[PDB]
Amino acid sequence: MFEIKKICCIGAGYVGGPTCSVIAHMCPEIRVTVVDVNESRINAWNSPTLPIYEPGLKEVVESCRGKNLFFSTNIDDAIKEADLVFISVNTPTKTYGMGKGRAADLKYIEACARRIVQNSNGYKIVTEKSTVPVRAAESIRRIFDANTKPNLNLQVLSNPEFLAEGTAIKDLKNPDRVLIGGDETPEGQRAVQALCAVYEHWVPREKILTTNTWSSELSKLAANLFLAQRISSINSISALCEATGADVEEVATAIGMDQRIGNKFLKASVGFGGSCFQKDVLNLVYLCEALNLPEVARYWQQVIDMNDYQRRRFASRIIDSLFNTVTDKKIAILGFAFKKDTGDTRESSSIYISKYLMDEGAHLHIYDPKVPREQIVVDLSHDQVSRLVTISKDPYEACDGAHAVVICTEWDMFKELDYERIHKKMLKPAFIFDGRRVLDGLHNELQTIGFQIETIGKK
Amino acid sequence: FEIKKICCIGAGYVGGPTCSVIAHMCPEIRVTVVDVNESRINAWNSPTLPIYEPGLKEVVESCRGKNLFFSTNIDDAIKEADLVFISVNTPTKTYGMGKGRAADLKYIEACARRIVQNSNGYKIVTEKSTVPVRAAESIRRIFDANTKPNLNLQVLSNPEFLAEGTAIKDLKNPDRVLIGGDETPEGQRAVQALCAVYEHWVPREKILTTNTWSSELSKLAANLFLAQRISSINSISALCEATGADVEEVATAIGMDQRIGNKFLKASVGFGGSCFQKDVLNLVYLCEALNLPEVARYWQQVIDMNDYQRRRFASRIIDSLFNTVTDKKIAILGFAFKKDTGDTRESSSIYISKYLMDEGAHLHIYDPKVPREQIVVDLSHDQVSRLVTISKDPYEACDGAHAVVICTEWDMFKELDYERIHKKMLKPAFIFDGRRVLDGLHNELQTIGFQIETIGKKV
Amino acid sequence: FEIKKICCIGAGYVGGPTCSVIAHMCPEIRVTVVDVNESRINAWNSPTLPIYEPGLKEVVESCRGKNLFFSTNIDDAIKEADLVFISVNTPTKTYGMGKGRAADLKYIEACARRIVQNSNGYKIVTEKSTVPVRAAESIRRIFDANTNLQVLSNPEFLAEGTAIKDLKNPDRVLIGGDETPEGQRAVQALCAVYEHWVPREKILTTNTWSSELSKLAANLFLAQRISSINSISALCEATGADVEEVATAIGMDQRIGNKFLKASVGFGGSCFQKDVLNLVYLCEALNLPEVARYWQQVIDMNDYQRRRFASRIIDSLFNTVTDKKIAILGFAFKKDTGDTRESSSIYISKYLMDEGAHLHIYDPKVPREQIVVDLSHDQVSRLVTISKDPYEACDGAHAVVICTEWDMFKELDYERIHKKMLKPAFIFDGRRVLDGLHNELQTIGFQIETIGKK
Numbered sequence A: 001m002f003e004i005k006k007i008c009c010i011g012a013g014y015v016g017g018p019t020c021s022v023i024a025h026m027c028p029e030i031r032v033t034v035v036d037v038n039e040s041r042i043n044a045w046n047s048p049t050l051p052i053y054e055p056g057l058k059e060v061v062e063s064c065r066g067k068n069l070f071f072s073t074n075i076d077d078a079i080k081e082a083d084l085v086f087i088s089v090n091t092p093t094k095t096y097g098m099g100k101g102r103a104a105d106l107k108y109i110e111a112c113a114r115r116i117v118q119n120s121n122g123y124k125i126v127t128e129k130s131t132v133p134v135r136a137a138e139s140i141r142r143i144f145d146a147n148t149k150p151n152l153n154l155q156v157l158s159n160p161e162f163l164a165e166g167t168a169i170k171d172l173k174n175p176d177r178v179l180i181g182g183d184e185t186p187e188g189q190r191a192v193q194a195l196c197a198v199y200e201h202w203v204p205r206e207k208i209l210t211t212n213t214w215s216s217e218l219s220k221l222a223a224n225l226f227l228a229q230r231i232s233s234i235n236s237i238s239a240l241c242e243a244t245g246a247d248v249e250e251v252a253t254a255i256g257m258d259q260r261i262g263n264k265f266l267k268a269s270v271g272f273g274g275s276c277f278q279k280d281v282l283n284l285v286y287l288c289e290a291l292n293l294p295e296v297a298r299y300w301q302q303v304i305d306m307n308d309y310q311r312r313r314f315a316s317r318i319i320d321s322l323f324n325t326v327t328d329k330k331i332a333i334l335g336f337a338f339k340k341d342t343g344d345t346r347e348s349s350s351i352y353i354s355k356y357l358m359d360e361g362a363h364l365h366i367y368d369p370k371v372p373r374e375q376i377v378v379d380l381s382h383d384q385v386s387r388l389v390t391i392s393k394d395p396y397e398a399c400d401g402a403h404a405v406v407i408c409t410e411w412d413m414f415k416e417l418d419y420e421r422i423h424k425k426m427l428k429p430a431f432i433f434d435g436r437r438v439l440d441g442l443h444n445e446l447q448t449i450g451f452q453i454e455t456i457g458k459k
Numbered sequence B: 001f002e003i004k005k006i007c008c009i010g011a012g013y014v015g016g017p018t019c020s021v022i023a024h025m026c027p028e029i030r031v032t033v034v035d036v037n038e039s040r041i042n043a044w045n046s047p048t049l050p051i052y053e054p055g056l057k058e059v060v061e062s063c064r065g066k067n068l069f070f071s072t073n074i075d076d077a078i079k080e081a082d083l084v085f086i087s088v089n090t091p092t093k094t095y096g097m098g099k100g101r102a103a104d105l106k107y108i109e110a111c112a113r114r115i116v117q118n119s120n121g122y123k124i125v126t127e128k129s130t131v132p133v134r135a136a137e138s139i140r141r142i143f144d145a146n147t148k149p150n151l152n153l154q155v156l157s158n159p160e161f162l163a164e165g166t167a168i169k170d171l172k173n174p175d176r177v178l179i180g181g182d183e184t185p186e187g188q189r190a191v192q193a194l195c196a197v198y199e200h201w202v203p204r205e206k207i208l209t210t211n212t213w214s215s216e217l218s219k220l221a222a223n224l225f226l227a228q229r230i231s232s233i234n235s236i237s238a239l240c241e242a243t244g245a246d247v248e249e250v251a252t253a254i255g256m257d258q259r260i261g262n263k264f265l266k267a268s269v270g271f272g273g274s275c276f277q278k279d280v281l282n283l284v285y286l287c288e289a290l291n292l293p294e295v296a297r298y299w300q301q302v303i304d305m306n307d308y309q310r311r312r313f314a315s316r317i318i319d320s321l322f323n324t325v326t327d328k329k330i331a332i333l334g335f336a337f338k339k340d341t342g343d344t345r346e347s348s349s350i351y352i353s354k355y356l357m358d359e360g361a362h363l364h365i366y367d368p369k370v371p372r373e374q375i376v377v378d379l380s381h382d383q384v385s386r387l388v389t390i391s392k393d394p395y396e397a398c399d400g401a402h403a404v405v406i407c408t409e410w411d412m413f414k415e416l417d418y419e420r421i422h423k424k425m426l427k428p429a430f431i432f433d434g435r436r437v438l439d440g441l442h443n444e445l446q447t448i449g450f451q452i453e454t455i456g457k458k459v
Numbered sequence C: 001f002e003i004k005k006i007c008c009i010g011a012g013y014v015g016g017p018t019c020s021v022i023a024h025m026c027p028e029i030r031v032t033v034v035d036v037n038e039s040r041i042n043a044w045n046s047p048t049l050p051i052y053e054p055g056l057k058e059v060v061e062s063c064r065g066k067n068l069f070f071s072t073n074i075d076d077a078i079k080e081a082d083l084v085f086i087s088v089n090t091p092t093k094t095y096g097m098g099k100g101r102a103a104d105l106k107y108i109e110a111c112a113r114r115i116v117q118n119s120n121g122y123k124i125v126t127e128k129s130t131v132p133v134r135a136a137e138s139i140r141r142i143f144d145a146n147t148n149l150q151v152l153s154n155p156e157f158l159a160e161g162t163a164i165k166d167l168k169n170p171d172r173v174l175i176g177g178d179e180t181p182e183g184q185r186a187v188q189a190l191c192a193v194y195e196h197w198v199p200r201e202k203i204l205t206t207n208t209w210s211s212e213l214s215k216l217a218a219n220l221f222l223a224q225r226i227s228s229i230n231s232i233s234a235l236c237e238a239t240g241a242d243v244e245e246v247a248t249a250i251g252m253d254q255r256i257g258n259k260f261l262k263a264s265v266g267f268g269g270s271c272f273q274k275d276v277l278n279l280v281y282l283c284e285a286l287n288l289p290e291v292a293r294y295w296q297q298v299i300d301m302n303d304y305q306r307r308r309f310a311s312r313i314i315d316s317l318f319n320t321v322t323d324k325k326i327a328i329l330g331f332a333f334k335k336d337t338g339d340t341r342e343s344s345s346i347y348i349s350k351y352l353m354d355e356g357a358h359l360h361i362y363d364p365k366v367p368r369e370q371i372v373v374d375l376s377h378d379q380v381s382r383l384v385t386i387s388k389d390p391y392e393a394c395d396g397a398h399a400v401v402i403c404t405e406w407d408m409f410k411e412l413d414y415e416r417i418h419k420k421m422l423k424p425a426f427i428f429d430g431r432r433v434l435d436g437l438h439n440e441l442q443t444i445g446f447q448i449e450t451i452g453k454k
């Protein structure tokens, strides 16, 4: 019977923000207050230009901002007034100690939990939205039960997020499903039903799926595991195609017409990237090693190993094709973002293709149309960067007097280039290693030009 | 030109149904299925077909005697037919080099050589049999080594995608038909000619033409992807039992992401059937042939997971019976590898039954459609005489037993009288549900006094 | 056409002697030996050459400025030459993919590209560097791209220290080339150069790959022998047999030969280990792990032999060597050279340095700056002294460690050495140079331990 009147969200990031903006927009009589430790980020949200850009987000925020939606920096009063409290802070991979470089660090989630119980009174619904390790909600509950008061009654729910970077507003206005996890006790289900009620304001009851708490946490990770698996699986197929004279695009199409298999996430590449997949896989493999599930640990670890194989063997072909040495040779790196049409570099296959060539002493010239040059120096640093790396300002400068052109990001502009011009002003034999299949179709015109072309999944 | 006479060498789970469906759809084409096995051809020409397949008996009776024939006269059949299917079995080698891993092609080769010994003029030889990549090239060399004047034999790949239990449905309305052929003129003659046969009931949009190697590899990749889904959901199942999450919940949340799909996410004791294990093992072995050890161990994980799923389940039964099962009666419900078939090939029931037989148990096995003599054959290799009993009905098997092990998801098992089953079971009585069919009946079952444990649910 | 002008890119231990010997034999041919190291070139034009090779000083001074030249000007040497030798180094890559295994072909690639940037008309490019199999296909692809040049293989078989005798009286010459018309003309042209002083029966012609691979295979067999007889020495030590008797016995069987059966602390030198590693790394790419791990045993045994010997010393010195003066007699990798590439002396010294031993190192032909360089990367200032004469090195020494078979180490006065060593005294004979001299040393009071004696 509980009705959720005011909402607070700790963490105004890529998840915290748009999620609450849409809630605000869909349920005009609910107050949505987004707070965050980073005072700048909060300010950019009330600013004309948003901290994170998502198509349609500005329209949504500007619709209810100041009406029922508020961005604020006063976290404490947001919490003590709220009915439901989202925890949407980050869980970065631990950089030291046990689980170094795989395990998730809960220090921020724990900070939200302690600050909540500090400022809370009466009844409240705490809902974690961050990708957490299974039973991380058990920690939030430990903390709350340890620091209890009279009339304090805090209920912990899981409500993970699923939006893809790029389609967030669509993916939230019209979700494939909404996921809510709660205790299978009466205090839980009441809290589950309260969060349902909020999602019912624009999400049909049929797409709202309720589970237990650990099913919901585990669901978040596994969805990413299955997706990343699909890519590693087709990538391994692409290796096999090159050895047997098959074409991986032909094999993809045939596989994906099996409706039980489906056709999404089958485009073989030089490796997947992004701030989410590899992190979640490592998180799950570390969790498994801690629950004495080595069989399961090493099952999922093959998603990473294969993705690491895909990248390393690309670099190997380049060196193997360049007469086994690539030291002091100019090489063009076309594309630095992990996927096209973005400026995000996180875990981009190009960082590692570049780092491999940099270990040989190749003189790299890098071009991305959207990535700032100073970001590329960070991703390659940690200098060896000054001697070998050079961020070019247009593609043709990168290919001038180069041995090879390496395409590492699927930018559509790379499909349009003047490979006539590039060839005259390259060293011979000129090579093209395309690791994003963007040059599919153009293979014949390129050979006759004299270009030597090697692409993933075709001999 | 038109194919007017088809011959299919191999009257098994592929050759029978696929040919019945062609005849039923192509009245003007004479379809003859041949086999070296006379009892089987006898069964085909009888009111009791040699396999149980929903709907197969109507389709056969629909045109048997008119354009559909079953004979042991292989030689005259090859001679008469325009198109010759190769649809013989391709088991894993149980001996020699690659024992336990490599595919055994002795049955393909015998077809190829019989085909050439029986052939004049023009024929299209098509292999449906799942084979290693480059396997048609062998048939092609055998034909080239034994060409006689006017002998023109074209070779095609036409992998089959039906699933047992849904064969007539899959054949009558396939997601796709895949044909692999020479990029040469004679090959395109051959491929167009086979497209014409399927174009009688299969829309041209759903007919995929590729080269021979892509076709064979697609069939392999399709099966690998499917089996991977099962191993992936099963690996999640083990993690569920350790965390308290529920695999049926997690599966559901995962499958509503349309990029993943909701098919083939039903955790089990282990996938069976003639093809998944052997096809993975084939691809893995072939990867070693071609210096691709990374790919080999990426897919090897599919089998290892499945074998761990099975061992872990056997272990629950034994650990929950205090690690001693000697002379304890155990009911085994379901011996078929899936429901709606009589095929037991590689059924998890076999491996589960064998684990319990090694512990000295008294197994009473029931299954609605698997013939009695097949079960005895599958557990022999007597241990069977001392330990194994085939039960006429499920209540007999559960009578005086310590536990019920459900291995096949036949619908009837959910409908049993467990009230009755309990009174005559030894106490404490266990139901180990290896297929999640008793889901939602757990509360009722516990009050009846039954102890129920199922894949992917924390005890 | 008769080859009238020859260029050799790379004036090292191969390009220098091999071209000196070509010039001394062929007075109607102009041989210019070039290199980027200007100090190396200048030393080749000096009364003190940049390498110690017996007979080499005579040969060079007999032609330098008649038909033998050493220049920094790489381009004109190629432009005007009829034949360009590539004799540059192919080390083991210390970086990137295959670090510690694969051969670095960056110096070959440099020649191939400078040749075509600096040459017109007809020229013969010969690969004398020890390359992997099919590396001559790579130079061919380069030349057929930036387009008339022919590519040949002519590996060298000279061993350092005997380079002059081996170049004047070779067992055989190996020339590998294309099986084409254009190729077989270029091969018989190089034969003509060698036929001035090598008989035709001892000139062997094959194809490019068979030649590139014969060089590696030959060095494998050679290195395998040493390791093989070295393994027997450890067998001898445990059964009281004697490695020299066993070796002598083995070698009387004509089918085995009597050569390369001298046990030792471990084979060194620029090539064996890198060539074995090269071939192993070749084998992985070719999906041949048995061949790979077969030849890998040639390296493991070598490393074992050195370690076993280094531990011999530490164990015998009552298990501790910290702050103890030890003499290292012999830093070159073999006798009659000053090359210290992969000398076992480096590996024993580095082992002894890890124990904190103060080393005093002597070698007749190795210059002191090389030893300091070889033993570093300070730890060296603290622990390593370089002695002007041997008796200085052994003054107050706990032990004398012989790592090189310089004939003069017999000639020493171990009466005198023993009087001024700390007690008890030890000699560790890593080359068996002291056989027969034992009883003397035993009576003098020296404790003598060598390779292959219990």
Ligand SMILES: NC(=O)C1=CN([C@@H]2O[C@H](COP(=O)(O)OP(=O)(O)OC[C@H]3O[C@@H](n4cnc5c(N)ncnc54)[C@H](O)[C@@H]3O)[C@@H](O)[C@H]2O)C=CC1
Residues within 6 Å of the ligand: A010, A011, A012, A013, A014, A015, A016, A035, A036, A037, A038, A041, A088, A089, A090, A091, A092, A108, A109, A111, A112, A129, A130, A131, A132, A161, A162, A163, A164, A165, A275, A276
């Ligand atoms: N990036 C994505 O596409 C998705 C991310 N996620 C989850 O979101 C996490 C990070 O989310 P983002 O919004 O992308 O990152 P973010 O770092 O932009 O957002 C988290 C915000 O929380 C603030 N914060 C951290 N600790 C705090 C504390 N104790 N008190 C107050 N504010 C605090 C941070 O300053 C930051 O602005 C991931 O690790 C994952 O768990 C889930 C789905 C997708």
Ligand SMILES: NC(=O)C1=CN([C@@H]2O[C@H](COP(=O)(O)OP(=O)(O)OC[C@H]3O[C@@H](n4cnc5c(N)ncnc54)[C@H](O)[C@@H]3O)[C@@H](O)[C@H]2O)C=CC1
Residues within 6 Å of the ligand: B009, B010, B011, B012, B013, B014, B015, B034, B035, B036, B037, B040, B074, B087, B088, B089, B090, B107, B110, B111, B128, B129, B130, B131, B160, B161, B162, B163, B164, B274, B275
């Ligand atoms: N059973 C299935 O679900 C499917 C299997 N496949 C593939 O189709 C092939 C056939 O499989 P099944 O029909 O299940 O096997 P099966 O063993 O039931 O049928 C093969 C038939 O071929 C006959 N045969 C063997 N050698 C012969 C010869 N030299 N001459 C004449 N007849 C001969 C056998 O007696 C047998 O009746 C396999 O390669 C399998 O991988 C493809 C799709 C579905």
Ligand SMILES: NC(=O)C1=CN([C@@H]2O[C@H](COP(=O)(O)OP(=O)(O)OC[C@H]3O[C@@H](n4cnc5c(N)ncnc54)[C@H](O)[C@@H]3O)[C@@H](O)[C@H]2O)C=CC1
Residues within 6 Å of the ligand: C009, C010, C011, C012, C013, C014, C015, C034, C035, C036, C037, C040, C074, C087, C088, C089, C090, C091, C107, C108, C110, C111, C128, C129, C130, C131, C155, C156, C157, C158, C159, C160, C270, C271
């Ligand atoms: N040392 C030996 O006994 C033999 C060695 N070989 C092979 O012959 C080769 C020559 O080895 P070494 O002479 O001992 O080594 P090295 O290091 O003495 O000679 C290489 C010389 O070439 C110069 N060089 C390298 N790249 C150059 C370039 N691009 N342009 C101009 N000069 C360049 C270097 O400055 C150096 O002085 C090696 O590949 C070796 O494996 C073959 C037979 C015998």
Ligand SMILES: O=c1ccn([C@@H]2O[C@H](COP(=O)(O)OP(=O)(O)O[C@H]3O[C@H](CO)[C@@H](O)[C@H](O)[C@H]3O)[C@@H](O)[C@H]2O)c(=O)[nH]1
Residues within 6 Å of the ligand: A161, A162, A163, A164, A165, A224, A227, A231, A264, A265, A266, A267, A268, A269, A271, A272, A273, A274, A275, A276, A277, A338, A339
């Ligand atoms: O066919 C394909 C599709 C994608 N990719 C690669 O996959 C990577 C990841 O792309 P994407 O899925 O957009 O990553 P994210 O933007 O981080 O979003 C993922 O991670 C989020 C956080 O868990 C989930 O909400 C999303 O559903 C999931 O797509 C990229 O580098 C792509 O190049 C391929 O290689 N082939």
Ligand SMILES: O=c1ccn([C@@H]2O[C@H](COP(=O)(O)OP(=O)(O)O[C@H]3O[C@H](CO)[C@@H](O)[C@H](O)[C@H]3O)[C@@H](O)[C@H]2O)c(=O)[nH]1
Residues within 6 Å of the ligand: B130, B160, B161, B162, B163, B164, B165, B223, B226, B230, B263, B264, B265, B266, B267, B268, B270, B271, B272, B273, B274, B275, B276, B337, B338, B339
């Ligand atoms: O979610 C699932 C789906 C299946 N299974 C099991 O997996 C096995 C295989 O199931 P299914 O695919 O229906 O069996 P098959 O009849 O062997 O069909 C597969 O193998 C055929 C032979 O290659 C292909 O033609 C089909 O496309 C492919 O589905 C059976 O033991 C099932 O019980 C599960 O455990 N969970």
Ligand SMILES: O=c1ccn([C@@H]2O[C@H](COP(=O)(O)OP(=O)(O)O[C@H]3O[C@H](CO)[C@@H](O)[C@H](O)[C@H]3O)[C@@H](O)[C@H]2O)c(=O)[nH]1
Residues within 6 Å of the ligand: C130, C156, C157, C158, C159, C160, C161, C219, C222, C226, C259, C260, C261, C262, C263, C264, C265, C266, C267, C268, C269, C270, C271, C272, C333, C334
């Ligand atoms: O019976 C023996 C023979 C040699 N060695 C050791 O082997 C090493 C190398 O000796 P050697 O073969 O002379 O070395 P190199 O001077 O490098 O010559 C070898 O390596 C050259 C480069 O590949 C080839 O040209 C020669 O044919 C080949 O003998 C030295 O450290 C020696 O002490 C022994 O220990 N015992």
